[PDB]
Every structure is written in structure tokens, then in C-alpha cells.
Design a protein around this nucleic acid. Structure first.
Ligand SMILES: Nc1ncnc2c1ncn2[C@@H]1O[C@@H]2COP(=O)(O)O[C@H]2[C@H]1O
Ligand SMILES: Nc1ncnc2c1ncn2[C@@H]1O[C@@H]2COP(=O)(O)O[C@H]2[C@H]1O
Lengths: 197, 199
DNA sequence: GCGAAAAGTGTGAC
DNA sequence: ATATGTCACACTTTTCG
DNA sequence: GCGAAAAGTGTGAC
DNA sequence: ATATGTCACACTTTTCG
């Protein structure tokens, strides 16, 4: 609909998996769009520890926060979870496409709107739930979003305790002994893959 | 400017301190705007422990997360920190107000860009810093807010150690202690009103 | 500006 | 208290040419 | 579906 | 190896009518 006139004016690129689309602090000049695939947003403490803030996918805009004031820089990091085709438009041409048609600027804002809600939750979990709890929300919320494939009884999913470790914010081994205390307790089963029940 | 174009379409409302302007469950259908005053956004623990997410000052929009979808609830709480003339429109008259002068969709979206930056940072702080870390930072920030009196040396923040405990995610006593330590180092001076930068 | 009622705060071994 | 992190390395379990 | 690295992971007790 | 949460209430400071 609106997207094709939009998606026409962009330069399109294919990023191999694990590439770095965006760097923290780099000066924000380009908006992006995930035409194919998925990406990861994560930030970093000067002493190297990193935390995933979210997974983004086909349909979502990227690097939109730089768009509204200028001077500023990329707020987070965006790596390629897998291959992607990314339409890229300078802020400037986009600042224009909005003057022609108001619909794409909305299609952005809706996007930032649910992300400001999904993020605020994440603050509350970090502050109210102990790790064990955050991990069960992660294993629920993960095991549903499109990556997840319909297990007979309780969807399945592929995640490393390492990575659960950077969403929940604890470490592979604590993620470890706890996860098991779930299999035992009986609300999940796992072995490389994680079978939610 | 057309912000006035906006208010002249809106309808004000006077609130008093501590009054909860929005509540975490109800249906979003109005989009506030803070004429005069400050308000605080916070969520709650399964039993009441609050966690203030951010304060919102005059010239801010409130409850704009429903504006882009139907039948979504209000996601947090918002209580007047002070008195607040808070303008109102409704979702639809607002969209009707958009397809005409695109400007304020822009002025709203911009505020929602900052918020995700600030909130992203907060999740950095909770996940990376330890309490003295997070409390120093809270103090760097509030020292920087709009509601901060000037002091010869440093900024005079006015605040309740109970509040810092909420903002930061720690209990009341932990704040009291840390606050003490920082004074001993001569980094602040406290007594209800606090001064950041020695004293 | 008054103070009385309400709200805020330390303390310390687990 | 009570919850969670941090150590080394041989260990699985998953990678793919 | 072949094995061989490459990843990813469980110790425990401070 | 560690940090911060806990519990009660005299005592201190803020509120607001
Ligand atoms: N909390 C978040 N959730 C989702 N996407 C985010 C979040 N914070 C930042 N981003 C995205 O990550 C991008 C990083 O670069 P920009 O800040 O330029 O634009 C940002 C967008
Ligand atoms: N993380 C946040 N930062 C700032 N303001 C917020 C945040 N989350 C919600 N709000 C504001 O709080 C309002 C409460 O109701 P809505 O969710 O309808 O719209 C919300 C806006």
C-alpha cells in the first residue's frame, strides 16, 4: 500500500548473518527497514558486558530515534541475527516523504509505541522479579513470537543459556541450574532446544 | 505556532498534587498534554511496590500509546507531582487533527523517541550498575531535571529517599546509607533537600 | 507563618 | 539472612564442509 | 549423514 | 565471594489547614 512508494525510494542491502548493521554512538543519518529476516538490539557497558533489548523482524523500522532531532547518535547496537534485506533511506529524503504522505510517519510511530511499552515492562521485570521469574517470562514471550514452531504440546525453540543470559541479565550457569529447576518443577523440557509446555 | 492551534481544540483540566491522572488497566482513548505542572509515570509490583518509570513535565504529551491501535489499556500510572492544568482531546479528534496539520504528530513522535532512549538507558542501569552506581546516576539526572533550584555550589534537588529507592529499585534504607557515604566523601550534602557537587 | 498530625528515616545482625 | 555471581577446564551439543 | 573442530555448558564452594 | 533486603518504632522532618 503505502510501503511500496516508500520502499521504492530506498537503497536495498543484504547483510550476512552476524553482521553489524549499527554501532553505538555512530552519528545517526540513515533510517532502515527490514525487508527480510531478523536483527538484534543490544547495548554495552564499557567493561564489555552486553544485554539484548529486543529482537526486530521483517516489517519493523530501524534507527528511528535518531530521526527526530539530529546531531545525535545510534542509541543501541543492531547485529544481524541472520540474512536480511534492508532498505536504507537518508533521514533527509524520509523527512520529505512524510510531507507528501502522513501514513509512513504513523507506521513508524505505531512501531515506537509498542516498543516503549515492551521496554517499560522489561524495566519492571528487572526490578520486581528475581531471575527465576524473569526467565519464565522470557521462555513464555520467546516461545511464541515467529521463530517458534508448533510443538505438539507446548511450542519449541532454539536458544542458548548464554543468550537467555543476556535477555534476563544473569549468566549461562545461573541460567543453567535455574532452567533445570523448571524441567524438574516440570513447566519446560530442554536439550539445546527448549520445549515449552 | 500550531500547538495553540491544538490547545484551542483541546479542553483543559486542573488537577491537584498526588492525584492519579491515569491508571494501569483502563482503556486508552484520550491523549493528555501538560499545560502547567509535573506528573510521574510508575507501574506496580504484584503487591504495590511502585517503580517510578519517569517524571513528565509541562509541555509533555500523556497517554499517547493508544493513539495507534484500538482498545488498548492505559499502561502505567501517572500522578500529579504538583498541580497540573492538563489539556485534553480524544483519540479521533486528534487523528482528525493530524490529516490536516501534520506538525503535532511530529511533535508527539519526537517525545516518544526520547522516552525510548531514556528507558533503554534505565534498563542499562538496572542491568549493569550496582546501587551506588544507579543512585549517583539518578542524582546526575534529577540534578538535571526542570524542577531543580539553583544552589551556589551544586544543584538543589528536593527529594525523598523513599522516592530514590523507587526510581532505582532498592529499599529505603539502602538509599539512606549510600547517601551518607557520598556525603562523607563530600560529594553531596543532604537534609531533605540535597545538593549534588560537594557541600 | 502555626503547630499539630502525617510522613519520613536510622539502626544493625541475620 | 538469601539470592547470584565467579573460578578452570573437559564436557556435551551444535556447527557445517 | 560423515566425522572434527566449534559452540555451548555444569562443576562447586566460597 | 558479594551485596542489599529485612523488621519495628522512637525520633525527625514535612505537610497543610
Ligand atoms: N528498547 C528498544 N527496543 C527496540 N528497539 C530499540 C530500543 N532502543 C533502541 N532501539 C532501536 O535501536 C536503534 C539503535 O540506533 P538508533 O538509536 O539510531 O535507533 C534505534 C532503534
Ligand atoms: N517508559 C515510559 N516513559 C515515559 N512515559 C511513559 C512510559 N510508559 C508510559 N508512559 C506514559 O504513561 C501513560 C499512561 O497511559 P498510556 O499507556 O495510555 O500512555 C502513557 C504515556
Amino acid at each position: 500500500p503505502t510501503l511500496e512508494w516508500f520502499l521504492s525510494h530506498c537503497h536495498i542491502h543484504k547483510y550476512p548473518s552476524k553482521s553489524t548493521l549499527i554501532h553505538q554512538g555512530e552519528k545517526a543519518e540513515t533510517l532502515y527497514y527490514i525487508v527480510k529476516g531478523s536483527v538484534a538490539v543490544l547495548i554495552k557497558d564499557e567493561e564489555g558486558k552486553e544485554m539484548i533489548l529486543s529482537y526486530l523482524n521483517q516489517g519493523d523500522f530501524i534507527g528511528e530515534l535518531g530521526l527526530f532531532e539530529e546531531g545525535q547518535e545510534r542509541s543501541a547496537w543492531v547485529r544481524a541475527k541472520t540474512a536480511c534485506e534492508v532498505a536504507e533511506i537518508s533521514y533527509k529524503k524520509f523527512r520529505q516523504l512524510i510531507q507528501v504522505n502522513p501514513d509512513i510517519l504513523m507506521r513508524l510511530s505505531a512501531q515506537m509505541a509498542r516498543r516503549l511499552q515492551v521496554t517499560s515492562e522489561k524495566v519492571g521485570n528487572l526490578a520486581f522479579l528475581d531471575v527465576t521469574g524473569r526467565i519464565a517470562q522470557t521462555l513464555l514471550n520467546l516461545a511464541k513470537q515467529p521463530d517458534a514452531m508448533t510443538h505438539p504440546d507446548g511450542m519449541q525453540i532454539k536458544i542458548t543459556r548464554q543468550e537467555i543470559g543476556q535477555i534476563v541479565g544473569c549468566s549461562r550457569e545461573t541460567v543453567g541450574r535455574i532452567l533445570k529447576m523448571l524441567e524438574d518443577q516440570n513447566l519446560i523440557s530442554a536439550h539445546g532446544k527448549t520445549i515449552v509446555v
